[PDB]
Amino acid sequence: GTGMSVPEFVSDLDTPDPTIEVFLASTSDPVIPEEGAQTAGEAYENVDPVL
Amino acid sequence: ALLSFERKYRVRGGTLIGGDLFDFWVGPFYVGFFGVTTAFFALLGTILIFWGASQQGTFNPWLINIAPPDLSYGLGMAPLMEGGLWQIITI
């Protein structure tokens, strides 16, 4: 009775964010590290945060 | 009681429905088929409003509130204590 609501068109509710499918086409699962695996620092010359 | 010039206008006839089954006056008010229906509907609505007020918990004229149902009921009929009273009073 207080008038607190949010209206939306039904056809608009069925159109998702078009950028959702772009992210799912560019993602991948992480790879569990093995015992004493080689790091990125020892193979190239990189910066400490990603070393 | 009539006005000084009123008696010559109070003739019989001119009804959409009913004839002289309801063709009279009560005080100054004219009664007809639609006077009867008006009385019924208005009295029922007012009494139902006061019943809802008594079940709400307040008789304060500023604070009485009878509300429509929740949006999850759609266009169907709600329980009388959760919004059905509003629908009956609207009718």
Summarize the SSE layout with pairings.
The structure is cut from a larger assembly and holds chains A (51 residues) and B (91 residues).
Chain A: H1 10-13, H2 20-24
Chain B: E1 24-26, E2 29-31, H1 33-56, H2 80-90
Antiparallel strand pairs in B: 1-2
Helix pairs in contact in B: 1-2
What do these coordinates show?
- The structure is cut from a larger assembly and holds chains A (51 residues) and B (91 residues).
- Chain A has helices spanning 10-13, 20-24.
- With 51 residues, chain A is mainly alpha-helical.
- Chain A is elongated and about 65 Å long.
- With 91 residues, chain B is mainly α.
- Chain B has two helices and two strands; from the N terminus they run ββαα.
- Chain B has a two-stranded antiparallel ribbon with strand order 1-2.
- In chain B, helix 1 packs antiparallel against helix 2.
- Chain A binds chain B through residues 1, 5, and chain B through 65, 67-68, 71.
- Chain A: It comes from Dinoroseobacter shibae (strain DSM 16493 / NCIMB 14021 / DFL 12).
Which structural class fits the helix and strand makeup of chain B?
Answer: mainly alpha
Order of helices and strands of chain B: EEHH
Our count of helices of chain B gives 2
> What is the element string of chain A, with H for helices and E for strands?
HH
PDB class: photosynthesis
Keywords: reaction centre light-harvesting 1, photosynthesis
Entry title: Cryo-EM structure of the Dinoroseobacter shibae RC-LH1 supercomplex with incomplete LH1 ring(State 1)
Chain A: Photosynthetic reaction center cytochrome c subunit
